[PDB]
Amino acid sequence: TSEPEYVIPDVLVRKVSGRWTVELNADSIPRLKINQQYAAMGNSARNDADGQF
């Protein structure tokens, strides 16, 4: 008889005052972080070629 829940809300339109305020899922949206350390580990690299590459 028993089951858990399985459906992923990716976008959300909540009918915000007519013409729903649709919005995606923020956490579900992927995003990367630029290596600012490696960004600062490249130019100063003695191989300024390797680091700038």
Partner 1 sequence: GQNMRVAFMPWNGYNFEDSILVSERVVQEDRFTTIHIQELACVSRDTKL
Contact residues toward partner 1 (CB under 8 A) are 3, 5-7
Smallest separation, CB 3 to partner 1 (Å): 7
DSSP H or E stretch at residue 49: helix 48-52
Q: In whole angstroms, what separates CA 11 from the centre of its chain? A: 14
Question: Closer to partner 1 at the Cβ: 14 or 33?
Answer: 14
SS3 26: coil
Question: Closer to partner 1 at the Cβ: 2 or 37?
Answer: 2
Cα–Cα distance between 27 and 31 in angstroms, integer?
A: 9
Smallest separation, CB 6 to partner 1 (Å): 5
